[PDB]
Amino acid sequence: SVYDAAAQLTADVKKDLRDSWKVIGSDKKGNGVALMTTLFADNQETIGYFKRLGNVSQGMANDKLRGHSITLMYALQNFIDQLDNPDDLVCVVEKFAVNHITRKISAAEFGKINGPIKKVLASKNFGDKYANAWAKLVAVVQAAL
Amino acid sequence: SVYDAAAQLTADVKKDLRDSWKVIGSDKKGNGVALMTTLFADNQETIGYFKRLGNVSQGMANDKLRGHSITLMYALQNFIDQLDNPDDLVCVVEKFAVNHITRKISAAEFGKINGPIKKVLASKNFGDKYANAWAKLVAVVQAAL
Numbered sequence: 346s347v348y349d350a351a352a353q354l355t356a357d358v359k360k361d362l363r364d365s366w367k368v369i370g371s372d373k374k375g376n377g378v379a380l381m382t383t384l385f386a387d388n389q390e391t392i393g394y395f396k397r398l399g400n401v402s403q404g405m406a407n408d409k410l411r412g413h414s415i416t417l418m419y420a421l422q423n424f425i426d427q428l429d430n431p432d433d434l435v436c437v438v439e440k441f442a443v444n445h446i447t448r449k450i451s452a453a454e455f456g457k458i459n460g461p462i463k464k465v466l467a468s469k470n471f472g473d474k475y476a477n478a479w480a481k482l483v484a485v486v487q488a489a490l
Numbered sequence: 491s492v493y494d495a496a497a498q499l500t501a502d503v504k505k506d507l508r509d510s511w512k513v514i515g516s517d518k519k520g521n522g523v524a525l526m527t528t529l530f531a532d533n534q535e536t537i538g539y540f541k542r543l544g545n546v547s548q549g550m551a552n553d554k555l556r557g558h559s560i561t562l563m564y565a566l567q568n569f570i571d572q573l574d575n576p577d578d579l580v581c582v583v584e585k586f587a588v589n590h591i592t593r594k595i596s597a598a599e600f601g602k603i604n605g606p607i608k609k610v611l612a613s614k615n616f617g618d619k620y621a622n623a624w625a626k627l628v629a630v631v632q633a634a635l
Protein backbone atom coordinates (compact mmCIF):
# COMPACT_ATOMS: atom_id res chain seq x y z
CA SER A 346 0.00 0.00 0.00
CA VAL A 347 1.08 3.61 -0.54
CA TYR A 348 1.20 4.24 3.23
CA ASP A 349 3.46 1.21 3.84
CA ALA A 350 5.70 2.20 0.88
CA ALA A 351 6.00 5.80 2.17
CA ALA A 352 7.20 4.24 5.48
CA GLN A 353 10.24 2.76 3.69
CA LEU A 354 11.67 6.27 3.19
CA THR A 355 14.05 6.16 6.17
CA ALA A 356 16.25 9.01 7.40
CA ASP A 357 19.24 8.16 5.25
CA VAL A 358 17.10 7.43 2.18
CA LYS A 359 15.56 10.92 2.56
CA LYS A 360 19.02 12.47 2.91
CA ASP A 361 20.45 10.68 -0.14
CA LEU A 362 17.37 11.82 -2.19
CA ARG A 363 17.89 15.42 -1.06
CA ASP A 364 21.67 15.46 -1.68
CA SER A 365 21.37 13.97 -5.18
CA TRP A 366 18.34 16.12 -6.12
CA LYS A 367 20.41 19.22 -5.19
CA VAL A 368 22.52 18.37 -8.21
CA ILE A 369 20.04 16.67 -10.56
CA GLY A 370 17.24 19.20 -10.00
CA SER A 371 19.69 22.01 -10.84
CA ASP A 372 19.16 21.56 -14.54
CA LYS A 373 15.60 20.44 -15.01
CA LYS A 374 15.62 20.83 -18.76
CA GLY A 375 18.87 18.98 -19.42
CA ASN A 376 18.41 16.16 -16.94
CA GLY A 377 14.67 15.91 -17.68
CA VAL A 378 15.42 15.47 -21.40
CA ALA A 379 18.27 13.07 -20.62
CA LEU A 380 15.88 10.88 -18.57
CA MET A 381 13.24 10.64 -21.34
CA THR A 382 15.76 9.99 -24.11
CA THR A 383 17.34 7.23 -21.97
CA LEU A 384 13.91 5.66 -21.33
CA PHE A 385 13.14 5.72 -25.08
CA ALA A 386 16.57 4.24 -25.90
CA ASP A 387 16.52 1.51 -23.26
CA ASN A 388 12.78 0.74 -23.48
CA GLN A 389 11.63 1.44 -27.01
CA GLU A 390 8.40 -0.37 -26.20
CA THR A 391 7.40 2.68 -24.09
CA ILE A 392 7.39 5.06 -27.06
CA GLY A 393 3.85 4.03 -27.97
CA TYR A 394 2.50 5.76 -24.83
CA PHE A 395 4.02 9.03 -26.07
CA LYS A 396 2.50 9.24 -29.52
CA ARG A 397 1.34 12.81 -28.82
CA LEU A 398 5.01 13.96 -28.54
CA GLY A 399 5.82 13.28 -32.18
CA ASN A 400 9.38 12.28 -33.12
CA VAL A 401 11.04 11.70 -29.77
CA SER A 402 14.43 11.06 -31.47
CA GLN A 403 14.69 14.81 -32.05
CA GLY A 404 15.40 15.16 -28.30
CA MET A 405 15.81 18.78 -27.16
CA ALA A 406 14.62 20.10 -30.54
CA ASN A 407 11.15 18.54 -30.11
CA ASP A 408 9.19 21.27 -28.35
CA LYS A 409 6.56 18.81 -27.03
CA LEU A 410 9.21 16.46 -25.63
CA ARG A 411 10.99 19.43 -24.07
CA GLY A 412 7.80 20.72 -22.44
CA HIS A 413 7.00 17.21 -21.09
CA SER A 414 10.57 16.63 -19.75
CA ILE A 415 10.72 19.95 -17.94
CA THR A 416 7.32 19.30 -16.39
CA LEU A 417 8.26 15.78 -15.25
CA MET A 418 11.11 17.34 -13.18
CA TYR A 419 8.57 19.51 -11.26
CA ALA A 420 6.68 16.36 -10.15
CA LEU A 421 10.02 15.06 -8.75
CA GLN A 422 10.61 18.44 -7.07
CA ASN A 423 7.16 18.15 -5.55
CA PHE A 424 7.94 14.65 -4.12
CA ILE A 425 11.30 15.86 -2.62
CA ASP A 426 9.57 18.85 -1.03
CA GLN A 427 6.99 16.53 0.66
CA LEU A 428 9.60 14.22 2.23
CA ASP A 429 9.21 15.83 5.71
CA ASN A 430 5.52 15.01 5.87
CA PRO A 431 4.41 11.47 4.90
CA ASP A 432 0.75 12.54 4.85
CA ASP A 433 1.50 15.25 2.28
CA LEU A 434 3.78 12.95 0.28
CA VAL A 435 1.08 10.32 0.06
CA CYS A 436 -1.69 12.72 -1.06
CA VAL A 437 0.65 14.21 -3.73
CA VAL A 438 1.63 10.69 -4.96
CA GLU A 439 -2.00 9.57 -5.21
CA LYS A 440 -2.85 12.81 -7.06
CA PHE A 441 0.07 12.16 -9.49
CA ALA A 442 -1.10 8.57 -10.00
CA VAL A 443 -4.60 9.52 -11.32
CA ASN A 444 -3.47 10.42 -14.86
CA HIS A 445 -1.01 7.50 -15.01
CA ILE A 446 -3.75 5.06 -14.01
CA THR A 447 -5.99 6.59 -16.69
CA ARG A 448 -3.26 5.92 -19.25
CA LYS A 449 -2.95 2.31 -18.12
CA ILE A 450 0.60 2.66 -16.90
CA SER A 451 1.06 -0.28 -14.52
CA ALA A 452 3.52 -0.45 -11.61
CA ALA A 453 5.87 -2.65 -13.77
CA GLU A 454 5.74 -0.20 -16.66
CA PHE A 455 6.42 2.79 -14.37
CA GLY A 456 9.37 0.93 -12.76
CA LYS A 457 11.14 1.11 -16.14
CA ILE A 458 12.18 4.69 -15.17
CA ASN A 459 14.63 3.23 -12.63
CA GLY A 460 17.26 2.39 -15.35
CA PRO A 461 17.14 5.93 -16.76
CA ILE A 462 17.38 7.40 -13.25
CA LYS A 463 20.35 5.26 -12.38
CA LYS A 464 22.11 6.28 -15.59
CA VAL A 465 21.47 10.02 -15.10
CA LEU A 466 22.71 9.77 -11.50
CA ALA A 467 25.85 7.86 -12.55
CA SER A 468 26.51 10.64 -15.06
CA LYS A 469 26.70 13.09 -12.09
CA ASN A 470 28.92 10.88 -9.99
CA PHE A 471 26.07 9.43 -7.89
CA GLY A 472 26.44 5.66 -7.57
CA ASP A 473 24.34 2.68 -6.52
CA LYS A 474 23.49 4.00 -3.08
CA TYR A 475 21.68 6.91 -4.75
CA ALA A 476 20.05 4.79 -7.45
CA ASN A 477 18.64 2.58 -4.68
CA ALA A 478 17.30 5.61 -2.69
CA TRP A 479 15.50 6.78 -5.84
CA ALA A 480 14.15 3.27 -6.52
CA LYS A 481 12.52 3.54 -3.05
CA LEU A 482 10.82 6.80 -3.94
CA VAL A 483 9.67 5.31 -7.28
CA ALA A 484 8.28 2.34 -5.28
CA VAL A 485 5.92 4.77 -3.46
CA VAL A 486 4.43 5.75 -6.83
CA GLN A 487 4.29 2.13 -7.94
CA ALA A 488 2.27 1.27 -4.81
CA ALA A 489 -0.37 3.78 -6.01
CA LEU A 490 -0.66 2.36 -9.52
CA SER B 491 -0.73 32.52 -30.36
CA VAL B 492 0.93 31.66 -27.01
CA TYR B 493 4.08 33.47 -28.17
CA ASP B 494 2.03 36.65 -28.63
CA ALA B 495 0.52 36.46 -25.18
CA ALA B 496 3.97 35.70 -23.77
CA ALA B 497 5.05 39.01 -25.39
CA GLN B 498 3.01 40.88 -22.76
CA LEU B 499 5.30 39.58 -20.03
CA THR B 500 7.55 42.68 -20.03
CA ALA B 501 10.54 43.01 -17.77
CA ASP B 502 8.42 44.87 -15.16
CA VAL B 503 5.71 42.23 -15.26
CA LYS B 504 8.34 39.44 -14.85
CA LYS B 505 9.88 41.21 -11.87
CA ASP B 506 6.52 41.62 -10.13
CA LEU B 507 5.72 37.95 -10.73
CA ARG B 508 9.12 36.79 -9.32
CA ASP B 509 8.91 39.05 -6.21
CA SER B 510 5.37 38.03 -5.33
CA TRP B 511 6.13 34.33 -6.04
CA LYS B 512 9.03 34.59 -3.61
CA VAL B 513 6.33 34.97 -0.91
CA ILE B 514 3.38 33.05 -2.31
CA GLY B 515 5.42 30.04 -3.40
CA SER B 516 7.06 29.78 0.09
CA ASP B 517 3.92 28.01 1.50
CA LYS B 518 2.66 25.89 -1.39
CA LYS B 519 0.20 23.92 0.73
CA GLY B 520 -1.29 26.93 2.60
CA ASN B 521 -1.51 29.19 -0.45
CA GLY B 522 -2.53 26.42 -2.87
CA VAL B 523 -5.44 25.45 -0.57
CA ALA B 524 -6.42 29.12 -0.02
CA LEU B 525 -6.51 29.50 -3.86
CA MET B 526 -8.76 26.48 -4.34
CA THR B 527 -11.14 27.27 -1.48
CA THR B 528 -11.45 30.86 -2.67
CA LEU B 529 -12.29 29.65 -6.18
CA PHE B 530 -14.98 27.33 -4.83
CA ALA B 531 -16.39 30.12 -2.61
CA ASP B 532 -16.53 32.78 -5.28
CA ASN B 533 -17.48 30.56 -8.24
CA GLN B 534 -19.41 27.65 -6.81
CA GLU B 535 -20.13 26.31 -10.35
CA THR B 536 -16.43 25.41 -10.69
CA ILE B 537 -16.94 22.53 -8.19
CA GLY B 538 -18.59 20.78 -11.13
CA TYR B 539 -15.16 19.85 -12.53
CA PHE B 540 -13.87 18.53 -9.19
CA LYS B 541 -16.23 15.69 -8.33
CA ARG B 542 -13.18 13.39 -7.96
CA LEU B 543 -12.00 15.47 -4.95
CA GLY B 544 -15.10 14.60 -2.90
CA ASN B 545 -16.03 16.82 0.03
CA VAL B 546 -14.26 20.04 -0.94
CA SER B 547 -15.94 21.71 2.02
CA GLN B 548 -13.33 19.98 4.23
CA GLY B 549 -10.62 22.24 2.79
CA MET B 550 -7.08 21.45 3.90
CA ALA B 551 -8.28 18.33 5.79
CA ASN B 552 -9.45 16.71 2.57
CA ASP B 553 -6.40 14.74 1.39
CA LYS B 554 -7.40 14.78 -2.29
CA LEU B 555 -8.04 18.55 -2.26
CA ARG B 556 -4.76 19.07 -0.37
CA GLY B 557 -2.94 16.82 -2.92
CA HIS B 558 -4.39 18.74 -5.88
CA SER B 559 -3.68 22.17 -4.22
CA ILE B 560 0.01 21.45 -3.55
CA THR B 561 0.43 20.12 -7.12
CA LEU B 562 -1.22 23.18 -8.67
CA MET B 563 1.57 25.31 -7.05
CA TYR B 564 4.28 23.30 -8.91
CA ALA B 565 2.70 24.29 -12.24
CA LEU B 566 3.07 27.96 -11.20
CA GLN B 567 6.65 27.26 -9.95
CA ASN B 568 7.44 25.79 -13.40
CA PHE B 569 5.98 28.84 -15.18
CA ILE B 570 7.88 31.33 -12.97
CA ASP B 571 11.12 29.41 -13.53
CA GLN B 572 10.73 29.72 -17.34
CA LEU B 573 10.04 33.47 -17.52
CA ASP B 574 13.40 34.38 -19.11
CA ASN B 575 13.14 31.91 -21.95
CA PRO B 576 9.98 32.42 -24.02
CA ASP B 577 10.63 29.23 -25.98
CA ASP B 578 10.61 27.11 -22.78
CA LEU B 579 7.71 29.05 -21.28
CA VAL B 580 5.61 28.39 -24.33
CA CYS B 581 6.40 24.66 -24.46
CA VAL B 582 5.59 24.21 -20.72
CA VAL B 583 2.32 26.22 -21.13
CA GLU B 584 1.19 24.15 -24.13
CA LYS B 585 2.11 20.92 -22.22
CA PHE B 586 0.06 22.18 -19.24
CA ALA B 587 -2.97 23.01 -21.42
CA VAL B 588 -3.33 19.50 -22.93
CA ASN B 589 -5.22 18.04 -19.92
CA HIS B 590 -7.17 21.21 -19.40
CA ILE B 591 -8.42 21.15 -23.02
CA THR B 592 -9.34 17.49 -22.58
CA ARG B 593 -11.47 18.48 -19.59
CA LYS B 594 -13.15 21.09 -21.75
CA ILE B 595 -12.06 24.04 -19.63
CA SER B 596 -12.35 27.13 -21.85
CA ALA B 597 -10.22 30.26 -21.56
CA ALA B 598 -13.19 32.04 -20.01
CA GLU B 599 -13.62 29.35 -17.39
CA PHE B 600 -9.86 29.25 -16.67
CA GLY B 601 -9.96 33.02 -16.12
CA LYS B 602 -12.14 32.54 -13.04
CA ILE B 603 -8.81 31.84 -11.20
CA ASN B 604 -7.91 35.58 -11.44
CA GLY B 605 -10.17 36.68 -8.53
CA PRO B 606 -8.80 34.00 -6.17
CA ILE B 607 -5.25 34.96 -7.20
CA LYS B 608 -5.94 38.62 -6.46
CA LYS B 609 -7.38 37.78 -3.00
CA VAL B 610 -4.45 35.50 -2.11
CA LEU B 611 -1.95 38.22 -3.18
CA ALA B 612 -3.87 40.82 -1.16
CA SER B 613 -3.82 38.56 1.93
CA LYS B 614 0.02 38.84 1.70
CA ASN B 615 -0.18 42.59 1.04
CA PHE B 616 0.50 42.42 -2.74
CA GLY B 617 -1.67 45.11 -4.31
CA ASP B 618 -3.32 45.64 -7.69
CA LYS B 619 0.08 46.08 -9.38
CA TYR B 620 0.77 42.43 -8.59
CA ALA B 621 -2.69 41.08 -9.46
CA ASN B 622 -2.37 42.69 -12.94
CA ALA B 623 0.97 40.98 -13.44
CA TRP B 624 -0.56 37.62 -12.54
CA ALA B 625 -3.52 38.25 -14.81
CA LYS B 626 -0.98 38.61 -17.71
CA LEU B 627 0.58 35.20 -16.87
CA VAL B 628 -2.89 33.56 -16.72
CA ALA B 629 -3.59 35.14 -20.17
CA VAL B 630 -0.65 33.16 -21.67
CA VAL B 631 -2.34 29.99 -20.48
CA GLN B 632 -5.70 31.29 -21.75
CA ALA B 633 -4.10 31.75 -25.18
CA ALA B 634 -3.36 27.98 -25.23
CA LEU B 635 -6.90 26.89 -24.28
Ligand code: HEM
Pocket residue numbers: 391394395397398413416417418420421441444445448450454455456457458585588589
Ligand atom coordinates in the same frame (compact mmCIF):
# COMPACT_ATOMS: atom_id res chain seq x y z
C1 HEM C 1 9.94 9.52 -12.72
C2 HEM C 1 8.83 9.06 -13.24
C3 HEM C 1 7.77 9.94 -13.90
C4 HEM C 1 7.40 11.18 -13.58
C5 HEM C 1 7.89 12.11 -12.44
C6 HEM C 1 6.33 11.55 -14.50
C7 HEM C 1 5.69 12.77 -14.50
C8 HEM C 1 4.70 13.21 -15.38
C9 HEM C 1 4.00 14.49 -15.35
C10 HEM C 1 4.20 15.61 -14.33
C11 HEM C 1 3.11 14.46 -16.38
C12 HEM C 1 2.13 15.57 -16.77
C13 HEM C 1 0.77 15.51 -16.00
C14 HEM C 1 -0.02 14.26 -16.33
O1 HEM C 1 -0.59 14.33 -17.46
O2 HEM C 1 -0.10 13.28 -15.56
C15 HEM C 1 3.25 13.17 -17.02
C16 HEM C 1 2.61 12.76 -18.17
C17 HEM C 1 2.72 11.54 -18.86
N1 HEM C 1 3.35 10.45 -18.31
FE1 HEM C 1 4.47 10.38 -16.61
N2 HEM C 1 6.11 10.52 -15.40
C18 HEM C 1 6.98 9.54 -15.05
C19 HEM C 1 7.08 8.29 -15.66
C20 HEM C 1 6.30 7.89 -16.72
C21 HEM C 1 6.42 6.58 -17.38
C22 HEM C 1 7.51 5.55 -17.02
C23 HEM C 1 5.50 6.55 -18.31
C24 HEM C 1 5.16 5.54 -19.41
C25 HEM C 1 5.78 4.38 -19.56
C26 HEM C 1 4.75 7.81 -18.26
C27 HEM C 1 3.72 8.16 -19.12
C28 HEM C 1 3.22 9.45 -19.26
C29 HEM C 1 2.51 9.95 -20.43
C30 HEM C 1 2.24 9.08 -21.70
C31 HEM C 1 2.20 11.21 -20.17
C32 HEM C 1 1.51 12.20 -21.11
C33 HEM C 1 2.55 12.74 -22.15
C34 HEM C 1 1.94 13.83 -23.02
O3 HEM C 1 1.12 13.40 -23.85
O4 HEM C 1 2.25 15.02 -22.85
N3 HEM C 1 5.24 8.62 -17.22
N4 HEM C 1 4.22 12.40 -16.38
Ligand code: HEM
Pocket residue numbers: 440443444536539540542543558561562563564565566586589590593595599600601602603
Ligand atom coordinates in the same frame (compact mmCIF):
# COMPACT_ATOMS: atom_id res chain seq x y z
C1 HEM D 1 -3.57 29.04 -12.04
C2 HEM D 1 -4.43 28.12 -12.44
C3 HEM D 1 -4.27 26.59 -12.46
C4 HEM D 1 -3.19 25.84 -12.29
C5 HEM D 1 -1.73 26.31 -12.05
C6 HEM D 1 -3.64 24.44 -12.39
C7 HEM D 1 -2.79 23.35 -12.32
C8 HEM D 1 -3.21 22.03 -12.39
C9 HEM D 1 -2.32 20.91 -12.35
C10 HEM D 1 -0.79 21.05 -12.22
C11 HEM D 1 -3.08 19.80 -12.41
C12 HEM D 1 -2.56 18.35 -12.42
C13 HEM D 1 -2.11 17.84 -13.79
C14 HEM D 1 -3.28 17.71 -14.73
O1 HEM D 1 -4.07 16.75 -14.55
O2 HEM D 1 -3.50 18.56 -15.61
C15 HEM D 1 -4.45 20.25 -12.55
C16 HEM D 1 -5.58 19.42 -12.59
C17 HEM D 1 -6.90 19.85 -12.78
N1 HEM D 1 -7.27 21.12 -13.08
FE1 HEM D 1 -6.08 22.76 -13.26
N2 HEM D 1 -5.01 24.40 -12.65
C18 HEM D 1 -5.40 25.69 -12.69
C19 HEM D 1 -6.73 26.11 -12.90
C20 HEM D 1 -7.82 25.26 -13.10
C21 HEM D 1 -9.20 25.76 -13.28
C22 HEM D 1 -9.59 27.22 -13.18
C23 HEM D 1 -9.97 24.63 -13.42
C24 HEM D 1 -11.48 24.48 -13.63
C25 HEM D 1 -12.37 25.43 -13.45
C26 HEM D 1 -9.08 23.48 -13.40
C27 HEM D 1 -9.48 22.16 -13.49
C28 HEM D 1 -8.67 21.10 -13.21
C29 HEM D 1 -9.16 19.76 -12.86
C30 HEM D 1 -10.67 19.37 -12.81
C31 HEM D 1 -8.09 19.00 -12.65
C32 HEM D 1 -8.03 17.52 -12.19
C33 HEM D 1 -8.42 17.47 -10.70
C34 HEM D 1 -8.36 16.09 -10.10
O3 HEM D 1 -9.34 15.32 -10.29
O4 HEM D 1 -7.36 15.74 -9.43
N3 HEM D 1 -7.76 23.90 -13.25
N4 HEM D 1 -4.50 21.62 -12.57
